[PDB]
Design a protein around this ligand. Structure first.
Ligand SMILES: Nc1ncnc2c1ncn2[C@@H]1O[C@H](COP(=O)(O)OP(=O)(O)O)[C@@H](O)[C@H]1O
Ligand SMILES: Nc1ncnc2c1ncn2[C@@H]1O[C@H](COP(=O)(O)OP(=O)(O)O)[C@@H](O)[C@H]1O
Lengths: 113, 418, 411
């Protein structure tokens, strides 16, 4: 019987309109907070009492180390192995053609809303 | 690895009393000649004489090269031993006499211990302080150290384009900088030892190497830059000026105990190939107080000297130079000795031989030169191997000797002469 | 259509035609008859391939034209590539930029290979975009299966500046050097992975090591601007450093062959040098060829077999090649015809066989092509007997030419 996906024709990328630059940052930020996030897959109270804690003296906010001297290393994000490549659209890194395939099908451009 | 014609010779094979054994460190037979070589080898170890000369004489194949190599083995690696062919003196860049003198100087060695240190690591910082000095931080797997560096060295750093994160090997005494790469984390591994490496290099040099290093200048950045570009032939050093001055500085360091002289050997093969002007230079040269011991080898008897076109002399060497030389005669082997040599060569070369195969191969060695019996072993073993056998059965030697002829048999074939 | 290499005297020799018991097929791989000598060549060829024994010497002797250079080329072709086979004539060592002894040792050391196995990683793709911010930039590369961005750091962007201001080029980047090489305008773009780890097995002669390390930019091995390497120093420590590469995993040595054709042209200085040059671990096998009988050695007045001094003939094994019968002559002529484009009548083969068995083999082999052309003139398609007779009249051989000196000319 039929190929049975032309009915849903999800992506149909004649009008793809890549997401880039600041959008990448958004994704990065999102991922960071998700790795910093909690059980559900009080934080507002934490942010409130943290914004009470703002000052120039030695405190929570001023105890951040900062950027590292040893430069950032590439990793694949699909299997986590060292990654010679970058995805042209979103900037996330990968190490094979197969990994680019999976990434294009599940993580490239799809979760930027 | 890689067996060679003499690689079974492990020494002269004398005992503690001097007298030669029938078979020893690779060598078998040549009782009297090995005894004579054993006497001169202690002349070499004495480090006392200069320019003493020996002629290993005899027919081709009678072990004379083997005895010279046995001397070289008997001494070890701590004293020089320079192989030359008399044919090598006919240089096209350099006058024969100067090839000969250079080889006389290759054969005198000089041991010298330098306790020396090099600083290596990933450079963490550089700060020059008109520059009074440069502070440089170096990192290895055993920590970090802050170095103060002579400001002249600060030129080298900029010439090598070193900057923080590079791995470098700044040498303490020279001040020489070599940029080994970029550090692994950004390429070469972070050095895994201490940042201040210190070691006593006890490696040795020779007088000729010194002469050559003093023949031509280095660096300069002026007109000299173009001297770094032209074709670089060898040229004669100056007898009564440069190489004598080298003698002076070497004596200065010997007096200080920094260096120790190790007089070696110059071994000249096929000495009959030297020109008569070479022979006469040579017998003006090995009377010098600085010369090595020189071992000559010649495999032809009474015949005409080179470059005279009619003067005939024993061993192809003028009577003048045959005086002031001690002659060691080597002689032809008996069938028993040739059998032993064939056996030693076989077991050196990795070959198994059946007793009847060995006996007939030795008999071949009686109809024909020993060296030919020794030739046949490997191809005969290769046939045996290709017939699936481990040993050389007689079926293989007594048939491989039909594929390959020897000099005499092939000469008899050539006697059809058309 | 026509490449550099064309039909030469030994083109038909595709190998040394032996069964793997080292037994010669009476006609195989272009080689005919000559059984004893060819199987002896087989033994020394397997001894070459074993490699464990250094500095062995074989002399292959016989009349002119009795297959001895053909046997040498058969060994070369049977040995195949990636094992050095340095072929020179005895006349090659007589030189003006270096001495004959030095040229001979250089020939010895072109003939030992060092096999060194190295892993790099190579990028290969079509350029999609490139950037410059006067400096840093970025590069996007495309294989038909993927595209990626790279950051153009200082050395990489400097390297890419060498032949810039174009895009859509399909190029390779060596991540070691930054060496860019471009195949052309997107010739098709590449398949598979963009960046791959890759292995190269370099085989480099000892002469090449020695030359590269003789001098700053000493790699003029391309034009022989070296004039005698510094032996015992820049040549003793290369031997030591190769012995250090070995027995550690860095490299393995591949001992090849040195073929000295017409060794009777060497002189006793050169022969005396061979005596000792054959006796070191780094000595290859050398095989050498000679027509001459018992003749005067060059450089002296001494008569000797093969024109080679006897103390060197002690040092080598002497193969003898033998002259050909009618059958072997006919078969060689057939194989030459099959290597060239010609076809002949069987009567033409018979006539040419007797012609070559009368005068000399090589003359008949030469007549093949001439008769082919003569038949082409009359727009034939197979060489006939009268073509051979015509060509036999047009082109003389040495014997009939000498006979025709019943008239007189200069001396
Ligand atoms: N006394 C010995 N014991 C064992 N093997 C020997 C002895 N003398 C010679 N040989 C072997 O026989 C060969 C004869 O060659 P060689 O001695 O170099 O000739 P020459 O004496 O003319 O230099 C040597 O290369 C060596 O392999
Ligand atoms: N056994 C053989 N098989 C094939 N061709 C041969 C054979 N012997 C000689 N030839 C050919 O005959 C000609 C004679 O040359 P060649 O035998 O190399 O001369 P030489 O033996 O004097 O070196 C060449 O064209 C060669 O290819």
């Amino acid at each position: 019987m039929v190929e049975k996906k032309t009915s849903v024709r999800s992506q149909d990328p004649g009008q793809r309109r890549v997401l880039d630059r600041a959008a990448r940052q958004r994704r990065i930020n999102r991922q960071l907070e998700a790795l910093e996030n909690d059980n559900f897959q009080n934080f507002q109270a934490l942010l409130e009492e943290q914004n009470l804690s703002v000052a120039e003296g030695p405190n929570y906010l001023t105890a951040c180390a900062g950027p590292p001297s040893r430069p950032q290393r590439p990793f694949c994000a699909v299997c986590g192995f060292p990654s010679p490549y970058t995805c042209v659209s979103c900037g996330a890194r990968y190490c094979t053609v197969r990994c680019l395939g999976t990434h294009q099908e599940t993580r490239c451009l799809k979760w930027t809303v | 690895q890689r067996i060679a014609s003499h690689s079974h010779v492990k020494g002269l094979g004398l005992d503690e009393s001097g007298l030669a054994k029938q078979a020893a460190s690779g060598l078998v037979g040549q009782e009297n000649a090995r005894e004579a070589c054993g006497v001169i080898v202690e002349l070499i170890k004495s480090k006392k004489m200069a320019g003493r000369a020996v002629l290993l004489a005899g027919p081709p194949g009678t072990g004379k090269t083997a005895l010279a190599l046995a001397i070289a083995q008997e001494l070890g690696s701590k004293v020089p031993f320079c192989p030359m062919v008399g044919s090598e003196v006919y240089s096209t860049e350099i006058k024969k006499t100067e090839v000969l003198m250079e080889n006389f100087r290759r054969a005198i060695g000089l041991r010298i211990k330098e306790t020396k240190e090099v600083y290596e690591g990933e450079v963490t910082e550089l700060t020059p302080c008109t520059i009074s000095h440069v502070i440089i931080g170096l990192k290895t797997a055993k920590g970090t150290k802050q170095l103060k560096l002579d400001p002249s060295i600060f030129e080298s750093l900029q010439k090598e384009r070193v900057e923080a994160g590079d791995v470098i090997y700044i040498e303490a005494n020279s001040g020489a900088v070599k940029r080994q790469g970029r550090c692994d984390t950004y390429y070469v591994p972070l050095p895994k030892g201490d940042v201040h490496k210190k070691k006593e290099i006890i490696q040795d040099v020779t007088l000729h190497d010194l002469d050559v290093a003093n023949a031509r200048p280095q660096g300069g950045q002026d007109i000299l830059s173009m001297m770094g570009q032209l074709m670089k032939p060898k040229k004669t050093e100056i007898t009564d000026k440069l190489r004598g001055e080298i003698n002076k500085v070497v004596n200065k360091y010997i007096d200080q105990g920094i260096a120790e002289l190790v007089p070696g050997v110059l071994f000249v093969d096929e000495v009959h190939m030297l020109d008569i002007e070479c022979f006469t230079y040579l017998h003006r040269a090995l009377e010098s107080s600085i010369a090595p011991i020189v071992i000559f080898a010649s495999n032809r008897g009474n015949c005409v000297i080179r470059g005279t076109e009619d003067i005939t002399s024993p061993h192809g060497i003028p009577l003048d130079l045959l005086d002031r030389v001690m002659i060691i005669r080597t002689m032809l082997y008996t069938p028993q000795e040739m059998k032993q040599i064939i056996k030693i060569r076989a077991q050196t070369e990795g070959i198994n031989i059946s007793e009847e195969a060995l006996n007939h191969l030795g008999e071949i060695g009686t109809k024909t030169t020993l060296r030919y019996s020794v030739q046949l072993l490997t191809p005969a073993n290769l046939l045996a191997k290709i017939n699936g056998k481990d040993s050389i059965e007689k079926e293989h030697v007594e048939e491989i000797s039909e594929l390959f002829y020897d000099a005499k048999s092939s000469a008899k074939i050539l006697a059809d002469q058309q | 259509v026509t490449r550099i290499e064309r039909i030469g005297a030994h083109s038909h020799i595709r190998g040394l035609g032996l069964d793997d018991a080292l037994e010669p097929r009476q006609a195989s791989q272009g080689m005919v008859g000559q059984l004893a000598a060819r199987r002896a060549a087989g033994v020394v060829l397997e001894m070459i391939r074993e490699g464990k024994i250094a500095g062995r010497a074989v002399l292959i002797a016989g009349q002119p034209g009795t297959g001895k250079t053909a046997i040498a080329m058969g060994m070369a072709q049977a040995l195949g590539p990636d094992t050095p086979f340095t072929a020179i004539a005895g006349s090659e060592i007589f030189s003006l930029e270096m001495s004959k002894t030095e040229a001979l040792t250089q020939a010895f050391r072109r003939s030992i290979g060092v096999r060194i196995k190295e892993e790099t990683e190579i990028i290969e793709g079509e350029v999609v975009e490139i950037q410059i911010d006067r400096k840093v930039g970025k590069l996007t590369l495309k294989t038909t299966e993927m595209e990626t961005i790279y950051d153009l750091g200082t050395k990489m962007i400097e390297s890419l500046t060498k032949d810039k201001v174009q895009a859509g080029d399909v190029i390779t980047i060596d991540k070691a050097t930054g060496k860019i090489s471009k195949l052309g305008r997107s010739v098709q773009c590449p398949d598979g992975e963009l960046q791959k780890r890759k292995e190269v097995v370099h085989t480099v002669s000892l002469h090449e090591i020695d030359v590269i390390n003789s001098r700053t930019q000493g790699f003029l091995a391309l034009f022989s601007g070296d004039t005698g390497e510094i032996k015992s120093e820049v040549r003793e420590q290369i031997n030591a450093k190769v012995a250090e590469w070995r027995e550690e995993g860095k490299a393995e040595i591949i001992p090849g062959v040195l073929f000295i054709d017409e060794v009777h042209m060497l002189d006793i200085e050169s022969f005396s040098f061979l005596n000792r040059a054959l006796e070191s671990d780094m000595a290859p096998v050398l095989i050498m060829a000679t027509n001459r009988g018992i003749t005067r050695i060059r450089g002296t007045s001494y008569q000797s077999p093969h024109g080679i001094p006897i103390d060197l003939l002690d040092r080598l094994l002497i193969v003898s090649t033998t002259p050909y019968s009618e059958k072997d002559t006919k078969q060689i002529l057939r194989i030459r015809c099959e290597e060239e484009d010609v076809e002949m009548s069987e009567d033409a083969y018979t006539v040419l066989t007797r012609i070559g068995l009368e005068t000399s083999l090589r003359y008949a082999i030469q007549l093949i092509t001439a008769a082919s052309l003569v038949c082409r003139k009359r727009k034939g398609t197979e060489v006939q007997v009268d073509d051979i007779k015509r060509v036999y009249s047009l082109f003389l051989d040495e014997s009939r030419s000498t006979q025709y000196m019943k008239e007189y000319q200069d001396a």
